[PDB]
Amino acid sequence: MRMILMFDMPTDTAEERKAYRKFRKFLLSEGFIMHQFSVYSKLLLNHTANTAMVGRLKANNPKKGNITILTVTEKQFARMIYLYGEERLVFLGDNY
Amino acid sequence: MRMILMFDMPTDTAEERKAYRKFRKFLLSEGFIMHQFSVYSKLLLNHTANTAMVGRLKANNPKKGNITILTVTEKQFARMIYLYGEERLVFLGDNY
Amino acid sequence: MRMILMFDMPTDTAEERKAYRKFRKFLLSEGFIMHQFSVYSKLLLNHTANTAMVGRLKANNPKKGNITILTVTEKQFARMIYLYGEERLVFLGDNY
Amino acid sequence: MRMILMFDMPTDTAEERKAYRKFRKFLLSEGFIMHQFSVYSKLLLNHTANTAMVGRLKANNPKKGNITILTVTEKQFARMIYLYGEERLVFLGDNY
Amino acid sequence: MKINFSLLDEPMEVNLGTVLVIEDVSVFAQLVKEFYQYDEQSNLTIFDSKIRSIRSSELLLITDILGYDINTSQVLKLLHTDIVSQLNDKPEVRSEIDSLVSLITDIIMAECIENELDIEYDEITLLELIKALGVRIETKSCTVFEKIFEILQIFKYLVKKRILVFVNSLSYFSKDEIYQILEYTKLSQADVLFLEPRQIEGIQQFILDKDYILMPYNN
Amino acid sequence: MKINFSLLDEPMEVNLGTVLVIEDVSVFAQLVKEFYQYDEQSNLTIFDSKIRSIRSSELLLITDILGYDINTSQVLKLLHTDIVSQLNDKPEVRSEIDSLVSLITDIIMAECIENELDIEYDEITLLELIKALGVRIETKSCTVFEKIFEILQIFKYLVKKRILVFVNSLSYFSKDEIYQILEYTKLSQADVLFLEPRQIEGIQQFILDKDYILMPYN
Amino acid sequence: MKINFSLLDEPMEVNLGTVLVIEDVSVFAQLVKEFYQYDEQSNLTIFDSKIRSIRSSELLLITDILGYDINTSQVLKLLHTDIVSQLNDKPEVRSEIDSLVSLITDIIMAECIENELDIEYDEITLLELIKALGVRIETKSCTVFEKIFEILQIFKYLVKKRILVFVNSLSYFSKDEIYQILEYTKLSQADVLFLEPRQIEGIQQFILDKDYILMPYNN
Amino acid sequence: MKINFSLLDEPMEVNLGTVLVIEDVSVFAQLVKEFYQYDEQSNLTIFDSKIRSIRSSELLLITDILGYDINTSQVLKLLHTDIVSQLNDKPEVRSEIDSLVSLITDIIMAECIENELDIEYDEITLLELIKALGVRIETKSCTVFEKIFEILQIFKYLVKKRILVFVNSLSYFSKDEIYQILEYTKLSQADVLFLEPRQIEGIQQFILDKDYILMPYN
Amino acid sequence: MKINFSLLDEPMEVNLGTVLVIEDVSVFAQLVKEFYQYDEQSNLTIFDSKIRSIRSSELLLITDILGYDINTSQVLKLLHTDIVSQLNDKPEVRSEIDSLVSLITDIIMAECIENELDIEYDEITLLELIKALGVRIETKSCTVFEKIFEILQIFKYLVKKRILVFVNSLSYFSKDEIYQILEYTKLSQADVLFLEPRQIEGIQQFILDKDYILMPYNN
Amino acid sequence: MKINFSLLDEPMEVNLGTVLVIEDVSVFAQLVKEFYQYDEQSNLTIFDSKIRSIRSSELLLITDILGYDINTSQVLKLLHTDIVSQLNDKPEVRSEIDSLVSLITDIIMAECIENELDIEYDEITLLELIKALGVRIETKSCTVFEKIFEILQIFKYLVKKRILVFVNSLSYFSKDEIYQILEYTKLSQADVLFLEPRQIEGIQQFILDKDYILMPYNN
Ligand SMILES: [Ca+2]
């Protein structure tokens, strides 16, 4: 089970920044990789490590922190498209 | 097709904050809902609407903005779990 | 089955009065007895003669005529109380 | 106890018509419904209310007025059938 | 009752019977898949004169003719009500039936009086007589043509179905049988939409070319 | 019929109507528990004149008189089967019923042929006619005195039930109504046994003292 | 929760447990008949603080204690929900259960992957585990006292029942058991009304004399 | 396997995938009627390699591909029984499952004892665990080309069905998709027979002329 | 949409526009009275393909063309929604409108920041802009023909009205205007039934003779 | 009717009148804010014997006694119905009123017959006479004590309000007036919960110390 995890929290407070660093380090220690800011994912072996990981993430969530969790297949994970921020020739047909 | 979208960008400058507000308003106008900061999702009817939405998101991405796109099933989109938040010495009181 | 039958119709016109006399004579010919004006009853042997009598009454009903039909037991028929338009001594107890 | 009530009286005089209207309005105020002319019924809760209703009806009966009272079961009261309307020569046209 | 898809330029109206022929297998299979998945997909949109989109519960989709079950609780109930109305329209027949059921009630009542226990009953009605008779439609020995005809006859009995659609059902019927189906559909006033990969000769139909051009065709 | 429990010295016989008073609340509640659990518990026993144990299916236990439905699936099944047997005992009447049913089936069949839709039918049976008429025992009961009488009628009608038992049902009826119930039980010959926490004055009853000794009364 | 009948001078309030003793057999039998027929008869009227009359569906009448069925679909469903809430109140136990059903899900998933057919599943939840366990109340071996206690425990589970009434149920229980029933009723806050022909000694009750006089009685 | 009807001179054999075209609409509709009525009508017959007639229960007739539900009571029963057999083939894994179920039953039993209301339970079984998990075949089908593939998978999984028959199901698939379906049928070894009103170009099929003569094509 | 009365032998179907001419003044006035009283009287029965009788609320009756009020809360609301959909179908126009609204919101927001009190707002939407503009249909200067045309245009906006009926409305319009009304009704798909005492020349209509014979007439 | 908050160890029951005194200003202000925001906040939970949580619409919160509007459409309507019931309970008074109304109706009917136009009427009822009289509660000259008493009198008229709560309303009333309010609340059976920062001497109340300890207090 591919576990996609979004992480956010107000960063204004200094203790909030410290807690954000601590939670990020905890995510890296648990096997999660950061694709971009607030974007992470981890491969869970089965529903077992999935449920246990959900409990652990609920336990380690910092104050005011918010985590989104989504279950995704490998085919959907390979279809993940990340766009980081007007074509003269538009081709409708074979792309040559 | 359930589209999970993460959004991040340096917010330091005033122009960057204005661009962030504009991009967020554009995401809300397109049907995306914010589950938490940087965390959004939208239900796309089919693959064509998903591709057009990808092109539009690439066109509307602000400078230095970074967007992560992941495809999840509708049932897996409902499976989304949002968690909102080992010490030897526990202190209840002034933290000294 | 004790068949109680109420009969009414506008009597103003001469044709209406003639129809009322004809319908009343038909009720008397069928075995019905008139207890008072518009009040009649007949003893039907079983449900068969009751249904056939209902059909016949529907067939013989005069224009604008209206008939009410009620099924009543002998104990209820003996309990019929007819009042046609102040006690000094009221006794609550044995009536002596 | 389902109370079937028939009401008749000579209507010729104006005082008799006024008394008929008053008695009918009294019957409607007491909960009785008119299925047709001279034909009425009311659902009495028990035998006590039935006796009190009999006394009240005897007290409110107009001069020359005649009332027929019959007891019918609630299921037999629903069994009430209201019919609203052999000739050799049938004439469709002027009756000559 | 107009239906619209992305391939068509304007929504096409479906009145009485309508034969829609799709010459492209890809657009045909995609359209049928959009017919089964219609609640999930927004591509195919069917709306009435009010422009209100009909729910999939209001849409009736039929592919297998002999596999569909024509006998349902609502269809049999409304059919029994229709038979009761037909018997009620004739006063003489209703009177005779009342006489017979009356005699039977007399017999059973006598048998009840002969018993030692106190027994009560109410009535034997016509709807109870039809339900005891077990009146139902027979699809067992019916040919496919008679099956589709019975479906067109019971479509008026179905209250919730707004439109009936058949998928590739015109391949079984001969041209004359198709003429009978259309001529009967014009009398029944129901809205039926047929979807065929190949065009049928001799009947008016809407043809969709591989070029994705929709044209009316008399033959 | 006789009933036996560990508290009694010898089994007491229950013939026609019988009133049993238990002066101990623990022995009374435990006795009712033994009545509902009779299938599970072997303590309470019942020996008929044949001296043979009877299954709980043959024992009719009724506590609430008004809450006991007279119309049941088994009761209506046995009643409809009984009426079908009575109609089957007379060949001519059943023949006339078959003729009338044939006429009605011919009329409804003609109306079905008149319809444009194909219609398939099977037949009409006398059992379907009885069930269509809704034949059932009278459900009208003004008071518990009449309801218990209907319970005695249905109990005397049921052959499988060898005993009818009422638990604290005598508190609702007046002494005169108790006399009428006992006389009706003696006239109906059925076996009825009552269980009361306290004794009733004026009627013959078996009093079970707190000492567990059983003594006759009146 | 006040109840009123023609025999009473003023409507009497029923709060927590209430023992109503009717010394007249005629008024007692008539009142019980008015309790069973309550929807039909207007003599007995039960109203709340809003003066609104409660429906017979909102009234719960109980005479036979051991004959009543305590196990119902709604009672067992709400009971399973209550057990799920009890397991949810403890984080550690819920975590352990999640680990166990988690491992079971891993095993069954491996067995599904070993099969040739493509198989999909969702989850094994706690409510499904309780429904698979078949948790229900046991009235089989229960004494009458434990049965009435279980009825007082499940009366909170019944949503639609406004008031519970027992008919002659106090004759089976000893004085101490009655004290336990009342003391438990005060904690459960439910409204229970007992109807007995004879007065019980040692408990507060409302006595109705043959003179039709209602008086409070401490013993 | 072979199929025989009065129109054919000799029974034609159906091996792996087979495409049968009927150029007569009356013989095609009457043939489908003989397929749905096969139990009632003796005209259409099917003789396997053993030359033995097969009951309609062994014949799988599927007309609408999308309207055919993959999940059924019998299919889920055979699947759950198959998984139960696979878990029963390994004693150690089933022992661990019994241990975990014992732990969960101990926890839920302790929580039941903590409650003030009496609770009775029976046990938890592996079949109740599979049914509680909702094990079923995948219901996701994007196109009819995949749905027919799932129908071929479930058909090859079912041992009782000796033949699968499709009526006018080849009109939805493109020629290339028909080639993939034929190759998948030859790889799966299952017996599939198609009935089409008109001939398909590019594939091998048996053409039945309006003259009733049957001729091979490609 | 079939309508039936006692004078007709068979129920007549009303599809698109239908011109019904009653040559008898008694049957015409009685039929119009049965149209106004339709809920009270059982003589005139209008049913759909489902045979279900339509309620008088579903029936739309129109006699005075210029006296009828075309502007209603539901008609104006659904019309504003239709305009919002038309503006939403074009991405460029919607983008420009969003830009202008953004500028105005910036100005008003600056004015709010200049104030001493803390002020909060939400948004200025397109539906609020249309409601502030006061978009409505103008019947003041409209001719009777344009009024009936606008009624045929807003009949699609009315959700509850099943069928529109006009009473003696064809006397004002010229033959060409009637041809435009019918030709537009065929495109709008709405069901319109006209009732006229005298027959109109040149249009297909159903004629009811003084003999009570209903015949189709091409002219 | 039990209320519970995080500060309490066990949910406290509110029966008839209940005086809750919070000695801590922070917990008191936070509890009142949780009373106004109750639908938004999950901290304060009020449940009935069914354990079902009551909606904020079912909760009645009152702070300003003289600012609250006691006259509402539902309160005046149900009050007029209550007056009509009071007049209906007496046969003689109802007969006299019927006589007078009959006389007035005779006069107005004669005046209608004198007119040239044909006039029809129905009846003049008692509810219409009360509505014409304009019966309503007068809070204008009422003292705060009489205002709260009228609120306790109209709380039975309010159907949707499950519980009435007063915020710091006991500071205006004298000890004797508080005794009258409680003694009247015991008769009215309504559930009233008072919240005061300081304890009232002489009345039973629940005290919450700054230590967050809840204790019953007789004085
Ligand atoms: Ca039958």
Ligand SMILES: [Ca+2]
């Ligand atoms: Ca019946």
Ligand SMILES: [Ca+2]
């Ligand atoms: Ca189990």
Ligand SMILES: [Ca+2]
């Ligand atoms: Ca599950």
Ligand SMILES: [Ca+2]
């Ligand atoms: Ca706004």
Ligand SMILES: [Ca+2]
């Ligand atoms: Ca303006």
Ligand SMILES: [Ca+2]
């Ligand atoms: Ca009035």
Ligand SMILES: [Ca+2]
């Ligand atoms: Ca006034």
